[PDB]
Amino acid sequence: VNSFSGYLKLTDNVYIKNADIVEEAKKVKPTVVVNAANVYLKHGGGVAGALNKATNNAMQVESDDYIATNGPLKVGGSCVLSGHNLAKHCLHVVGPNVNKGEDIQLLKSAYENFNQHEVLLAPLLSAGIFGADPIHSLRVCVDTVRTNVYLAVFDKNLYDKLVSSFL
């Protein structure tokens, strides 16, 4: 039993809700919140810009030190950093950005990072400003993630389309 509330249950291990991931994170304080990161951990917009703003830029400060030490992530890769005031940990996961010409096939590799954590709050990877089809992202999520994932979909209209079209 966990403290996630109001989710529609899609599968044995995947749940979905219309919610602002920032506001959800502050309520539940999950062990792991997933950020929709880029390889440089530059948290400018989308989910990343919103999560960083909620940390008063502390996420960005920590991220800049991470990159200075380690260099960029791989597309499809991830790193675990602090969750600051939002969660215990933040799993920064890089899904391919279609608006950069990155291979959509890397989306499965990106979701595989979720399997290293028993429970996560997460957005649909590569959706929104990353340019991929959210219905496809949800399908890859369901077919790749085996751990317990609570998916927050910010757009109410998109949420209904995702639910109504789910196979």
Ligand SMILES: OC1([C@H]2CCCN2c2ncnc3[nH]ccc23)Cc2ccccc2C1
């Ligand atoms: O869910 C979506 C993702 C990607 C963009 C932002 N976004 C958020 N999700 C959850 N919480 C959030 N808080 C702040 C932002 C945000 C997925 C998606 C895909 C296409 C179009 C709109 C959207 C909303």
